[PDB]
């Protein structure tokens, strides 16, 4: 049987993987609060000639996320549930309010178009929820009953971004697929003498520009920055030094952390410059080396960093934030983490 | 001296004139609640080779709107206030939350680009307000103090659409410019024997398509439809017959209303087909005629309809809704109105 309360389906249609996971935690909480089954999203990759959709279960374990709230895979929804529960005629798009005729416009642009195209979904009308007192920070049952609205479909994730502290613990329920876990275990065993320090070096050209725009006087959250500076930055000011450490600062801090734990190796995950030769020179006095995956597979890198004896991340990066939350919440006790410039 | 509490400036960047006015009422209420001076928006026309900005005071009287809340013209803001109060470096865009790197993207598309271009404004950073409990349905003072944030700038009007019943009475404070008022008075005196019925015929091709999409089972508000069917349509179901009356239905109802008030003329405002010859044939038994402006000037048409002995509008149209609110609220007592199919 299908869920009498109905379903929620959405596109994680903002940003790259760290942003998608950040909003997905909020959506999980939203679905549980509404008591509707969540269709697990396809994640989205952009580093290809075309946008590419990745099934949830390629990356994470369905069994584990189900321990938080009721879920179904996109494949089950698409093949088994949709045809009778949600036929083309009742496929309505849900959004906050009409936007610039005025409506949700759920399939314009990228990845909005390709995401819904992938599952052969087009929308035939709009439903608005901006007038519901409190929005999605959980009337919804009053406004959208299951019989007429079996599926709530959102082209934008119905979740805050950046994520609120309240949902960070939901990362406990995102467990890497067995394939990724095994790839991580194998790389560690073959390459990384323990204890090892794992570091995230976020350093592509677009990033340095993001950091150089930091306005220290207004000191607002930027992406994941509350993971080290607290809600609304109550613990301090976000600086360029934290957002984009100098090569010198990276080396000094890696060497310090190697010393602090008696590390026997270093793992580096990077979007661009892994600094392997530079780190290796700096580590010569300790007779250990830094190691990277070739090529650098983002998911296996996240998994390796979650398994590290010590993780040093980038406080602003939502990609680092995945690792921080996993280390904080996957187990019964947190595994230690630090951040550059903190 | 300038307002120590600061300013609000915004683009009425959604839809045509009826939509812009509908959101402007909500923005007026918002500015009064925040106790900031409102920069009066340029309105936007699209029926030209390029988007065209119209100063507020070309259409409405500054003196009258000021009786509701503190306001300044765009010209005063732009020439006298902006240069010292809000220089390029502190021009931040305000939006609900980051949108697809993630941010407000306040100048992408049309009329967003041309609107801010017109006043030589570019933005250098973003501020978000989605995390403020209750949104803009008036913490704002706590989050955005006047000293650092002298000007809150919104690329989307910080107001509901369609407008809520609570702000409809603000139309009392939108009084046509003396130029428009005089044009209306002259047309009435020269052409329209009293008492006269004024009708709004919304009938361009795009409109009939809007109406044909009506889902009577879900019966949600569509544009201005709550002006005749009440909040959330508590009074009835929106039909195609109400949204887009047949020519036959238009004629029958005009003749009925002419009879009801002993009308000595009819005025027709239309976006497309004024039906003058057809209405004239139908009015032959009464020996009166229907009259239109050539060309049909939308603002003078609104003003004429506000002055009519009886107005028959289109319940779905936000353009008709301007007339309904003016007739309800400009004076001490409402002037009578009706709608096709109601
Ligand atoms: N491979 C690999 N790609 C990365 C790394 N770091 C950042 N990227 C890439 O750039 C992206 C990040 O944008 P998002 O994860 O949203 O993280 P933020 O942009 O860091 O908040 C990440 O999905 C990968 O695609 C890494 O360590 N490895
Ligand atoms: N001139 C003239 N233009 C009209 C009339 N009615 C609708 N239009 C045009 O089509 C537009 C309406 O879209 P908007 O006013 O937002 O009204 P809705 O689209 O009717 O909610 C209106 O601004 C004019 O530009 C009319 O009676 N006269
Ligand atoms: Mn990013
Ligand atoms: Mn319209």
Residue numbers in the entry:
A (entry chain A), B (entry chain A): 25 to 124, 132 to 169, 177 to 380
Q: What did the publication describing this PDB structure actually write?
A:
POFUT1 α-fucosylates serines or threonines present in EGF repeats containing the appropriate consensus sequence, C2-X(4-5)-[S/T]-C3, where C2 and C3 are the second and third conserved cysteines. In the present study we have solved the first crystal structure of CePOFUT1, which serves as a conserved family member. The protein shows a typical GT-B fold formed by two Rossmann domains. A cavity for GDP-fucose is localised in the interface between the domains and a contiguous solvent exposed pocket for EGF repeats was identified by electrostatic and docking studies.
The fourth one is a crystal-form-III in complex with GDP, resembling a product complex. The structures show the typical GT-B folding and a non-metal dependency. We also determined the activity of CePOFUT1 in the presence of 1 and 5 mM MnCl2, showing that the enzyme is inhibited by manganese (between 40–60% inhibition, data not shown), contrary to what has previously been described. CePOFUT1 is a catalytically competent non manganese-dependent enzyme, transfering fucose to MmEGF12. Unlike Asp242 or Asp244, Arg240 played an important key role in binding and catalysis. The role of Arg240 is crucial in order to stabilize the charge of the incipient free phosphate group thus promoting its dissociation from the anomeric center.
